[PDB]
DNA sequence: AATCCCAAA
């Protein structure tokens, strides 16, 4: 569908750090090109997707959202001569294995600056922290989604039918708590 | 300390 279901958005992008029940991953993405020394939004290079769930017919092994995203980039046929900025708004941050695959991609495509903005930090059974450091080392800009970024995704990716963004309880405090943990992860303190 | 986990009951 063209726009995300609002209940799906609200459920999946809730940023209570230790909340239960989020066993899917959603990813919104947008692309900019550097032109006349400023980033310009590519209107048709944006969208959203979810993970291919384990046991889904036609993909019984599943496919994480980040991988599904890297899968669409070649079809953009990005000019190998231009600089691009690709921003992903992820409900869960990348697992170790998908962090490594994203790090390989930006190592191989130096004309792409990747920004990952995540609602929640995915622990990956203690393995994600080193994955995120490795992704940052490769040049990705990783941050915790804030109020204005949730609102941006509501306004521009969600099928809101005119309804304004309604922040959930604790959004800012959750964002700030996650930002401290992300900094600790990226500084190798966690 | 552990919480939490692109599910599994
Ligand atoms: Zn993954």
Numbering used by the authors: 194 to 383
Passage from the reporting paper:
APOBEC3G (A3G) restricts human immunodeficiency virus type 1 (HIV-1), a finding that prompted extensive studies of APOBEC3 protein restriction of retroviruses and retrotransposons. The APOBEC3 proteins catalyze the deamination of deoxy-cytidine introducing C-to-U modifications in newly synthesized (−)DNA strands of the virus genome, which results in G-to-A mutations in (+)DNA as U is used as a template during (+)DNA strand synthesis. The C-terminal domain (CTD) of these APOBEC3 proteins is catalytically active, containing Zn2+-binding motif HxE-x23–28-C-x2–4-C. The catalytic mechanism of cytosine/cytidine deamination has been studied biochemically and structurally using deaminases from Escherichia coli and yeast. Although all APOBEC3 proteins deaminate cytidines in ssDNA, they show differences in preferred hotspot sequences as 5ʹ-CC for A3G and 5ʹ-TC for other A3s (A3A can deaminate 5ʹ-CC albeit to a lesser extent).
